[PDB]
Amino acid sequence: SAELTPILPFLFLGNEQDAQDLDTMQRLNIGYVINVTTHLPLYHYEKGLFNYKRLPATDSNKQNLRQYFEEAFEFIEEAHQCGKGLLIHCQAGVARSATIVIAYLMKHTRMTMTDAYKFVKGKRPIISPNLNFMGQLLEFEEDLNNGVT
């Protein structure tokens, strides 16, 4: 239908080409876009249709994504509470964006990390491996089971 991938009714996951399909954004009621890259444009910006957030992550083995989790969740919840969708995207393999969606699932739906991962991967089967992102997620999991995020 749309390389754009539904995770929740208000949350979708995509790559670069995914986030460039305007028709699909609109028929799915997406009002919000999170762009997890430093260098890509905010696609469709000058139509003045969407609420945007850049998370300017880089090509790095040491990219810290944890520092953005909370900001991302607030933007997601903003979309959610107003009855609109949010598209979160990066580039091919969606490793940055997948990381943030899995973290969102673990915090707000109580899914274990491995369960959160399986849920997303069952919907989007090409998730590139970032051992550094996975270690951050495991760290986040420990932090949620002690009450200190």
DSSP secondary structure string for all residues of 50-70: -EEEE----S-SS---HHHHH
Radius of gyration of the chain (CA): 14
Burial of 54 (0-12, 13-18, 19+ CB in 10 A): middle
Beta strands of the chain (E only): which ranges?
A: 5-8, 11-14, 30-35, 51-54, 85-89
Which residues have C-beta within 8 Å of that of residue 142, sequence separation ≥ 6? none
Q: How far apart are CA 12 and CA 3, in angstroms?
A: 10
Pairing of strands 51-54, 11-14: unpaired
Q: Which of these, 32, 2, 18, 7, lies nearest to 116 by C-alpha position?
A: 7
Exposed, middle or buried, 105 (CB in 10 Å: 0-12/13-18/19+)?
A: buried
Q: Which domain holds residue 5?
A: 1-149
Q: Are 97 and 40 a contacting pair, CB within 8 Å?
A: no
90 is known as an active-site residue? yes
Number of domains in the chain: 1
Our CA dihedral for 58, 63, 5, 69, rounded to 10 degrees, sits at: -120
User: Distance between CA atoms of 117 and 139, rounded to whole angstroms?
Assistant: 15
**CA–CA dist 92, 78 (Å, integer):** 26
Contact 33, 19 (CB under 8 A): yes
Estimate to the nearest angstrom the gap between the alpha carbon of 147 and the chain centroid: 23
β-bridge pairing 11-14 and 5-8: antiparallel
Question: How far is CA 58 from its chain centroid?
Answer: 15
How is residue 149 written in tokens? 């995020």
Q: Which residue has tokens 């000058």?
A: 46
Other beta carbons within 10 angstroms of residue 143's beta carbon come to 13
Catalytic pick among 28, 79, 90, 137: 90
Q: What angle do CA 25, 109, 63 make, to 5 degrees?
A: 70
End-to-end C-alpha distance for the chain, whole angstroms:
37
Distance, in Å, from the CA atom of 141 to the CA atom of 109, rounded to the nearest integer, reads 12
Distance CA 64, CA 57 (A): 8
Asked if 66 and 96 touch (Cβ cutoff 8 Å), the reply is no
